[PDB]
Design a binder for this molecule. Sequence first.
Ligand SMILES: Cc1cc2nc3c(=O)[nH]c(=O)nc-3n(C[C@H](O)[C@H](O)[C@H](O)COP(=O)(O)OP(=O)(O)OC[C@H]3O[C@@H](n4cnc5c(N)ncnc54)[C@H](O)[C@@H]3O)c2cc1C
Length: 453
Amino acid sequence: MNPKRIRALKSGKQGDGPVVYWMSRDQRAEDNWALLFSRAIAKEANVPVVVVFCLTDEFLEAGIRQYEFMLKGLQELEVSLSRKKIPSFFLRGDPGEKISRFVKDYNAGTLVTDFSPLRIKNQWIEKVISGISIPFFEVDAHNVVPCWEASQKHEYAAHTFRPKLYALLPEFLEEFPELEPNSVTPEVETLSDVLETGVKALLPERALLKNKDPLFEPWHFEPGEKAAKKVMESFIADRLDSYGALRNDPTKNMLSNLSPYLHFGQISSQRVVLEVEKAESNPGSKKAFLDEILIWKEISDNFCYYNPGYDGFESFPSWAKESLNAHRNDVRSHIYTLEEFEAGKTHDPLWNASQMELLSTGKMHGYTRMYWAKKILEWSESPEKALEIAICLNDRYELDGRDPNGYAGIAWSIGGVHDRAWGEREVTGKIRYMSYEGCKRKFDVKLYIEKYS
Ligand SMILES: Cc1cc2nc3c(=O)[nH]c(=O)nc-3n(C[C@H](O)[C@H](O)[C@H](O)COP(=O)(O)OP(=O)(O)OC[C@H]3O[C@@H](n4cnc5c(N)ncnc54)[C@H](O)[C@@H]3O)c2cc1C
């Protein structure tokens, strides 16, 4: 176990009670460095490990599609941890109040959590630190190379982050040790009841069409650790060979469809990389897929960790901020409100089709996501308004939303983060432009539009 994966958030006097793993981002029992590190510290102090998950007050800012996908995975996860004799405790409320109360009530010895560079997780960490006196650690269980180890600063391009990450792959890309069970079982409600009351609170804001029928289709992605491994296995056996050639075709289901599991932490990216690396397939397709799950996925964490305003106009590159400012007063071709963007009521059928796929499946195709966000910038009153509209629609309806990938993806599409300057245009400036005619020359746009009416 590499000690570079764990960081100390607060020193203190160790108690003699169970080591608490405050699971937030990596919701799985297998291939979890944070859970393995908690078990090892628990073994060293002769004390069992315990698992605590907080059901926060911010679930109403999202939809039923993410609430059910997350909770249905936790229901499977509770069974899996119980078989290895680790108990799980699900608290409802503020992590700053619930974690501090749980630590004091249960005489917790050491507190451990997983790593997340999002602002809301840092808000919880500040509150928890102020109310505990035991040691507090955090472990990077989401990235193959720890976020603080891959780079010590913000990387302005993938070609500058790629050699750094690949040089540390031989050290950090390793097999996971088996999660040992607790020696004996140690000494706040049923998740089914919490899911029932939560869904009832989210029903009035459900995404419906004119016929009052729900718009979301929940049969596209089954949640759970077991389902994530089946989707991963299918991708390697059926879709990895053709990934490098058809990853930009939204009319083909050639993507891995691993993002909803990767976002909630139901499957480890390191596990996916290990299986992909030992598979035999198209080397161009393997290189393309590893470039997406290693470089671009972990550079998103690098973006949010080293840019406090990762969701603001200030984090854009200087060339993009100057270009967008020089085109602020340019007359936009069209101006759509948030409701018009949300309902897919724009003049562009391709954009509307992309929005319908987001509304119905909860997972828009990777290529159309770039077109979807770049057209928001073209049809907004300001780049700051486009950032708000893109982030709102992304986090509300994407099953993988509220993720560092989305904010880094949105920053690339609108602010040119991790991109270069292109030909200068009106309104958009030097930001990379994607036209409707360009998409038609790339794939069958008519089929994609007809699929999502
Ligand atoms: C405007 C916009 C919004 C996005 N919103 C999200 C989002 O809300 N949540 C999210 O997790 N990703 C988002 N992405 C990144 C990307 O679109 C998705 O990760 C990808 O489409 C998810 O489907 P997939 O797993 O089948 O892709 P695959 O091609 O099968 O790649 C597998 C994994 O590689 C990673 N990956 C692939 N492409 C990217 C990328 N461009 N950036 C970062 N990581 C990537 C993902 O973790 C992905 O799960 C967004 C990108 C853009 C341009």
